[PDB]
Amino acid sequence: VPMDYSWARELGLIRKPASFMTSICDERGQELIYAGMPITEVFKEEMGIGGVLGLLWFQKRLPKYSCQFIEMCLMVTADHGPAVSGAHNTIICARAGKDLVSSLTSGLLTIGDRFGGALDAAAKMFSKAFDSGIIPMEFVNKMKKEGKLIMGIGHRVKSINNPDMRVQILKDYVRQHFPATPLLDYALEVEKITTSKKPNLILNVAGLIGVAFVDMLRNCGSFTREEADEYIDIGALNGIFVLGRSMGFIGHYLDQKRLKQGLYRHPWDDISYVLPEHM
Amino acid sequence: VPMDYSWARELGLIRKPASFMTSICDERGQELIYAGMPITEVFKEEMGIGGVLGLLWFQKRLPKYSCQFIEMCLMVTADHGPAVSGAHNTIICARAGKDLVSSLTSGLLTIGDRFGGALDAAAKMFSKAFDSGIIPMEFVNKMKKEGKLIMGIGHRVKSINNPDMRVQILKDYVRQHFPATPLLDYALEVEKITTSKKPNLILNVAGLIGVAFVDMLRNCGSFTREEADEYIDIGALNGIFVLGRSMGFIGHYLDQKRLKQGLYRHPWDDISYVLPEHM
Amino acid sequence: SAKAISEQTGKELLYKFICTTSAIQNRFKYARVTPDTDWARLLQDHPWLLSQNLVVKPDQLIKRRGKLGLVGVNLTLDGVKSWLKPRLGQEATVGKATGFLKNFLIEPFVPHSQAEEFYVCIYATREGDYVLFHHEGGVDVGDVDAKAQKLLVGVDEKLNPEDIKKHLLVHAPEDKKEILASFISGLFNFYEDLYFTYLEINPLVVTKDGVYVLDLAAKVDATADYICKVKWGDIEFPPPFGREAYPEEAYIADLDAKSGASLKLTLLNPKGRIWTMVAGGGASVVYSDTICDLGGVNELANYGEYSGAPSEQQTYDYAKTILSLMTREKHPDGKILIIGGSIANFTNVAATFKGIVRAIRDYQGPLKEHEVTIFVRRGGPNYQEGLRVMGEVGKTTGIPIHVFGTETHMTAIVGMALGHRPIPGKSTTLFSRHTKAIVWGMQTRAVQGMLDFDYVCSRDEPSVAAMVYPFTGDHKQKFYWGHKEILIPVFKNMADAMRKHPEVDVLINFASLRSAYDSTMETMNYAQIRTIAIIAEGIPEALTRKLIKKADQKGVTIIGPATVGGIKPGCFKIGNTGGMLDNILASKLYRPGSVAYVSRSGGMSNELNNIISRTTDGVYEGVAIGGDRYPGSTFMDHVLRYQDTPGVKMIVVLGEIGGTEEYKICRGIKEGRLTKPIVCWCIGTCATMFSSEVQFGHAGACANQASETAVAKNQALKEAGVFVPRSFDELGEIIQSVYEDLVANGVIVPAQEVPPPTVPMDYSWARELGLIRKPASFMTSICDERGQELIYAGMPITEVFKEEMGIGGVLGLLWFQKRLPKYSCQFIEMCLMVTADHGPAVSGAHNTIICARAGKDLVSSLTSGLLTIGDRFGGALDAAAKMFSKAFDSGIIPMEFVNKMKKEGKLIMGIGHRVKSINNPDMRVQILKDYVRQHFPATPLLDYALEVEKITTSKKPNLILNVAGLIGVAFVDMLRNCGSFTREEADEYIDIGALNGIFVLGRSMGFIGHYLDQKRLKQGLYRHPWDDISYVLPEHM
Amino acid sequence: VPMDYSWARELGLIRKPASFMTSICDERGQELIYAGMPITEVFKEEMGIGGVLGLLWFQKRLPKYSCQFIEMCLMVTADHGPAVSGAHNTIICARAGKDLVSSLTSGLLTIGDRFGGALDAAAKMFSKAFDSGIIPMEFVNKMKKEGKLIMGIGHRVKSINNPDMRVQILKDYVRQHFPATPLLDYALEVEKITTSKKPNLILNVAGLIGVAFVDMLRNCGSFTREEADEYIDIGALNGIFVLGRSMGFIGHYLDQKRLKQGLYRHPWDDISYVLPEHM
Ligand SMILES: CC(=O)SCCNC(=O)CCNC(=O)[C@H](O)C(C)(C)COP(=O)(O)OP(=O)(O)OC[C@H]1O[C@@H](n2cnc3c(N)ncnc32)[C@H](O)[C@@H]1OP(=O)(O)O
Ligand SMILES: CC(=O)SCCNC(=O)CCNC(=O)[C@H](O)C(C)(C)COP(=O)(O)OP(=O)(O)OC[C@H]1O[C@@H](n2cnc3c(N)ncnc32)[C@H](O)[C@@H]1OP(=O)(O)O
Ligand SMILES: CC(=O)SCCNC(=O)CCNC(=O)[C@H](O)C(C)(C)COP(=O)(O)OP(=O)(O)OC[C@H]1O[C@@H](n2cnc3c(N)ncnc32)[C@H](O)[C@@H]1OP(=O)(O)O
């Protein structure tokens, strides 16, 4: 009878390398641990979604204002109606009678450059401009001469004297709670220049969240500059938008299943057919 | 120094249970093997996609007519235009500039009961009717009194003197090549009864493919009745539709990328907003 | 627009920025005294006041100060002290203007002789900058244009130090020729790099010590603010003497500078009872002339205009500013608000009138108590909706509002408001039917209007061949050719567009003022483009002169900036000219006529379109050359074209105040070059009746001399033989009389009226009119993105945050459309917190980690993990809730439920743990259970599940309530025991999968954390080891 | 009563732009049309999966050898065992009892740069080298000096005297049937240089398929150079790999459901836990 692998490991007789590494959650043991913190201690220390997210995404005990800011970001990105690409896809999959997971996933797969990536894009653009040391006017001119529109700038209806009211809540929280907001100040200077061009070139929710998240990361004491830069590069802000919008997509799925909408077919009048004469 | 796991396994001193089982493909070894059959021999037997699918899905060497019929089924399910739910979702995800895999997956997640499940549904319905021993008229009456529509029956415009033209090719192939078609004959009797009701209640491409696939499975010598029943139960026909329509979904993605279509946002005039007064 | 700056500001800029080898004296050595200044403070911040003698003169843009006794010389500190108060803060009358003395300047006295009184002036012209120098300057300068040395410096030409001693310094003293020339060169550099348009130093004194600038009058191109921002700093533009500045004027000026639209407001008489809301500079000018033609000049309160398609918000801000200004004092006779305008070309009348009516609703109180009567005349895009909403506000507020449309002559609401009428080389042919244009910028509405015009004109091909937009990649844009759908290419670069479309001969530049110069300069590098239309307003005059010089060199016709463009009925239309297709059909601009016109204004050009269509055969060609000081092409440039064009039979010129341009037409008629009948009216006659120097909306609308007044121009044209109406009222009649007398002689043979091709109505317009019915394909009840504020299930987002709900409250709103209690929202949050992650070994976390190590993506990795959420993994929440709800609703006791599940071969969902049984519980079940038992009002299903747990643990210890079981039963309890849901609603939510949603949303946090962890650790591609896979392939299939 | 939108469109009284464009399939009409070509004629010309794929992906009537080569590419990319990332994910999702679509989709979402993207990577890399005009030795040295491995080069065990036997089949077909193989000849020259280094750097199946697909696109008469370049840029080879491996992923799902494997949990001994001491 051959030696039992588990019982050989128990005596430490053999060496089998572990193929996986994790640092965010320990399920083994008498107590569940979130990045070194017991779940009961998680609940006595009175964090919520923001604190749990800080533990699970950054392995940090964020300050209460940081945790609350993360919560508000999730609340403001929760939904933006059924007409966007992801909500449209989720509704189509729900009306196909498919599944909650399948419908939400179908909607989420649209999250990318054109839809839902402006948070990360604005964060990266403003961070690069701030770190290069160029002044906001030079940054605006450089984007204009490079044929690029500033990510996180520009609104559809709302302008100066017609505040977004989602940007205002987050901005007011950031000014009254964050210790320092250098990148937010830089982005506000850029916004002043762009609104001097045409009124609706205001800081978006995407731009506000991106710059405020970068400011939180590199101005709260939990992260070094390298850590904050790495998290921005690997996509913590993409994760923020995805987690926020999943709430709205699940709401849309539940809405369609309660309304008991049937299978959707796109009308032919809305499709232009440009097939070749004969291939 | 503790003993090496791999080298202790080579000496056969320890026992570690394998957590996975597979029977369709052997990647290791001098030659790639598809269900016991070398890849060079796969190409020497001049089989194609249908034969490779037979190997990889059923671990069987199907006859040439069976493999050719599988190929024709994939050919006829390849696409049905951009208005269906899956193609719509794929096009939305492509116009969001996302990715080929993400776009195709977004479209594929709609494949289920209401869209793309009629193949399996019709196969199961007709198999159950044929196995229960009831005549086609009794089957029609039982479905009528149970408040269920016969899946795989009923077209939109093409009824008679103008058939599906996709049902016709497949039915002609099955007639000329399949040895016996008991469930197909049963489905055709059901179709005669339903067309005696109103002309457009004809055997759909979904119904024809489902009944002909059950016929191929349980009338070619490769499978026993239990095996054919198990394959129908676990979803070989869902697999057939998914694989066939993947070709069309990828074509739709490539078409949108070539046409360079921008981000789609659903018009507000097409959405009815029925939010509550204040919640 | 050239704005005069104060002497202090000009001297400060000169001292700060001039670069001369000459030792400029008294640098930053001047004193400003005002009534609100402290003399001790000035004495201790400017000590030279005691060091030398003084000179004092006001700095309120008063000229001729020497001979009106406003300047005091050779008087000390005590002298200026005794000298100011008898004049400081007093009343002075210069010309027709009178005003206070709130600003004075004190400078050192310069001891100088009459032999060193020099005059140096630099002023801008179309062909360049003229530099005048006089050796006998000062008071005795006399005539300057005939006795002072003149020297033109052309556009893009440097004023070299030589040729100044040759042309400008013939009579200069030899001992001071060199330093004088150096100073003049430095002064020209100062003039050119700070975008001065006028710079007169009189007198200039140069002693052995150095050069003294005793005085200077300077006008600066205010539109160049975006260029000279750091050099000007906070440059201020004083109002003309006799006018006091107002915060409302400053607010409107800031609003105007903040956008590409035009917003002008000038307060002439705050006590006046006539107020105007006129769209368009030319329309505002003609309304002003009409008001002062009926004797309302004394009661005219403001001159104002809004142009450039202002937004709803901008129009609201403008309207509310004027409404607040109108509701300050009270007039016994009441007050009048003239909301006028021409027929707009592209200004959204609906949006602008929505802004105005919002302001009217906001001020309906003071407006009603002020007896304000509103007269409205307007036409343009969507004017029916705007007239409708203003009429509605007129009754929903009580304000007497009389709205009229195009059928009114637009100089009629003035008559019925003031109580006078009852209230009811360069080519000749720029465009043809084969003209192809390239549009710079995304102007899809403008391009579509162009295509609609081409279709109703029976053109073979669309007039727009390509579009250029540098902020996107090359693609094809979808447009309408009648009812057919066509694709128009869009290019990132000019070069690609001109490469692929060599047949294009016209550019329509929709670039802003900051991009128009560069785009036009780049455009004139292609010889195929023969006409460029520049739409942007606010381009600096120096840049426009550069464009003019290059276009003249290249033989390219430029339809000057700040123009709507032009229209040639039957052949071609520039941009938004002529408005939308309904106006094109109303003015019959799809077919040629015989009257060609040139105008400065665009809206006035649409008015001309309407008038000519009504009174004559029609329009052959109409060009608006723009309101800028230097148009790309002038009046004569187009009148010559029309005279040389055989299809036109009479010419209509709509001139303006300022610029001796109509005198060229007079000379052309005198020399016999112009022979066809010409009908001209020059607008701006009210400036002669205004006791001030008000600047109109147009940049060029400024009478610099006495011959550039509109009255003088109209008189000169009348003596030249041009048919000149008595006013803009009689323009239609004189055009009609000329057309009739030209028809009766057989000169004009009107053609048959062939009906135009029909264009289908737009779907959006038909929906707005409620003409058609299209069922909505989608239904939503959870979020309303449209509107001013985002709404989550009927409750605004600001209210969401003010009520202090968090994720739990937002989730209640978005998932159930209920305002859940605080404990319910908090419990939802804790459920999400406890389902957040359970390590990397579960199926979903494993799949997510695999996809992350495949280097894939956050969304793809999370989605790969989420697709495992189902029956075997992640579905125990819903399964336990459904099982326990069914058992509890069946009425069977927990023991019966346990026996039943045992006899059906089913394990109880949500029962059974791995290690933690009793005396050591889950520590997650405990937290949630303690919260539920402390905050939930009633927990019947939780009590039932606890009884079931008591039996299962009577069987074996680890059969305890799981986190899944406890969350399921507690969620059902919350749904059906908080007051928000009925039993049917709670059952439906449980059936459709709210608990599946809870688990999915909770575990998404852990899956994203796992993805980020793998990316931080930089784990490579995973491959499952072969020793862990059992291969059971058949022997040979 | 307002006019019906469909009635107003039929009368041509209103204009509503179509928000979607398609050029690959016409579902409306008496017959289904694949890129301008009727389905009955599709089956009459005796093309199969390869011809249908040519129609749906490129809107071209490819030559018979091109269609057959596309079929062989799909056949050789069908499966490579259960150990790869996508098959592993599919097997996990199937053992979670989930669904065919969900399981296949879970496996497919791994298709990207590290897994399954070598086809497109090799095609793009060799195309750039061939178009730049540098000789194979210069290309090899250039990739060496930029510290990049040549995509499509390098095998695990099979180098010479025992080649891949999939590369051999595809290469023999390409040599016998393709009119010209310039990029293939270039890649074989590169492979000779790399095998002069040590034998195991041979032309991979990924490299062979990439270069042979580029050769087919730009050497069959159906495409111009711009068209072939655009198709390679937008991801026809990614589509080829995805469609080929979907058959293997569905086979793996069906295999797991036939073997009735339970829920998988990764062993704790294979995971290294590196959580922080206390966050
Ligand atoms: C997530 C965020 O907060 S923003 C995300 C993007 N972030 C960026 O900053 C991207 C960079 N910035 C930009 O490119 C631009 O400034 C934009 C796109 C953000 C600004 O958008 P705009 O082009 O001004 O307007 P948008 O394209 O959203 O709206 C199109 C028009 O159709 C209308 N419209 C919008 N959605 C719909 C709909 N579903 N149905 C019908 N009409 C609609 C709107 O009224 C709008 O009209 P208007 O803009 O002329 O008033
Ligand atoms: C898609 C394709 O065709 S390959 C991708 C193409 N990309 C490129 O070609 C880019 C450049 N090429 C490369 O990166 C490299 O040449 C590779 C990765 C393709 C070749 O890698 P190699 O290190 O030569 O082989 P690989 O990493 O696949 O396998 C290494 C060894 O592990 C063994 N092995 C492979 N998979 C497993 C498994 N699941 N369990 C246990 N052992 C395994 C192999 O037998 C091989 O054995 P050896 O030690 O006797 O050589
Ligand atoms: C979401 C939830 O709350 S769980 C789902 C709830 N659903 C139900 O309640 C359904 C009914 N209940 C049941 O089916 C059962 O009671 C279960 C599955 C919940 C409990 O099953 P058990 O057999 O007690 O434990 P489980 O199957 O989890 O694993 C048992 C052993 O595997 C070991 N194990 C678990 N995970 C791993 C891993 N990743 N690696 C190695 N070993 C492991 C444990 O150490 C345990 O050993 P022990 O029993 O000697 O301590």
Ligand SMILES: O=C([O-])CC(=O)C(=O)O
């Ligand atoms: O094929 C049909 O007729 C039904 C259909 O649109 C699809 O599900 O593909």
Ligand SMILES: O=C([O-])CC(=O)C(=O)O
């Ligand atoms: O939470 C548990 O105990 C069971 C588990 O692993 C999961 O589904 O996440």
